[PDB]
Amino acid sequence: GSSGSSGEPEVTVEIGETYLCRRPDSTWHSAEVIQSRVNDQEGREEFYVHYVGFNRRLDEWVDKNRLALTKTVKDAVQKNSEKYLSELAEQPERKITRNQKRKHDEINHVQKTYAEMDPTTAALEKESGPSSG
């Protein structure tokens, strides 16, 4: 499928780096990006590239298209021979963690009882006597 595009990325140019600038000879020639500027009156972009292999009385602004931005544009992606990103270091990756807890307890109680006993008890002694005789 794929017919209607819904959004697209925006290219970008980097200063200090070298790019392939088109030439009026069906060819491309490297050119260091001096700086970058935008036209308000015209409403376009322009990058002052320097042809490191032509003349010193050159150095002129160019257009993004005129430059080589991604394999997308180039002389021909028939062969294409280049290395890959050359950068290795401690990649950003971390995720600490921790947790703990504890709880304890114990019931308690006391009880006691008593009883009251008898102290002491007893009787006396009855008696009697006659009279006659």
Swiss-Prot record:
Effect of disrupting the coding gene: Early embryonic lethality caused by the absence of histone H4 acetylation at 'Lys-16' (H4K16ac). Embryos fail to develop beyond the expanded blastocyst stage and die at implantation. Conditional deletion cardiac and skeletal muscles is deleterious for tissues with high-energy consumption, triggering hypertrophic cardiomyopathy and cardiac failure in hearts. Cardiomyocytes show severe mitochondrial degeneration and deregulation of mitochondrial nutrient metabolism and oxidative phosphorylation pathways.
Locus of motif Nuclear localization signal: 98-107
Compartments (UniProt record): Nucleus; Chromosome; Mitochondrion
Top-level division of the source organism's lineage: Eukaryota
Domain Tudor-knot: 13-68
Tissue and organ expression note: During oocyte development, expressed in both oocytes and granulosa cells.
Modified residues (N6-acetyllysine): K71
TM stretches of this protein: none
Family: Belongs to the MYST (SAS/MOZ) family.
Function of the protein: Histone acetyltransferase that catalyzes histone H4 acetylation at 'Lys-5'- and 'Lys-8' (H4K5ac and H4K8ac) or 'Lys-16' (H4K16ac), depending on the context. Catalytic component of the MSL histone acetyltransferase complex, a multiprotein complex that mediates the majority of histone H4 acetylation at 'Lys-16' (H4K16ac), an epigenetic mark that prevents chromatin compaction. H4K16ac constitutes the only acetylation mark intergenerationally transmitted and regulates key biological processes, such as oogenesis, embryonic stem cell pluripotency, hematopoiesis or glucose metabolism.
Subunit structure: Component of a multisubunit histone acetyltransferase complex (MSL) at least composed of the MOF/KAT8, MSL1/hampin, MSL2L1 and MSL3L1. Component of the NSL complex at least composed of MOF/KAT8, KANSL1, KANSL2, KANSL3, MCRS1, PHF20, OGT1/OGT, WDR5 and HCFC1. Component of some MLL1/MLL complex, at least composed of the core components KMT2A/MLL1, ASH2L, HCFC1, WDR5 and RBBP5, as well as the facultative components BACC1, CHD8, E2F6, HSP70, INO80C, KANSL1, LAS1L, MAX, MCRS1, MGA, MOF/KAT8, PELP1, PHF20, PRP31, RING2, RUVB1/TIP49A, RUVB2/TIP49B, SENP3, TAF1, TAF4, TAF6, TAF7, TAF9 and TEX10.
Official protein name in the record: Histone acetyltransferase KAT8
Covered range of the whole protein: 50 to 169 of 458
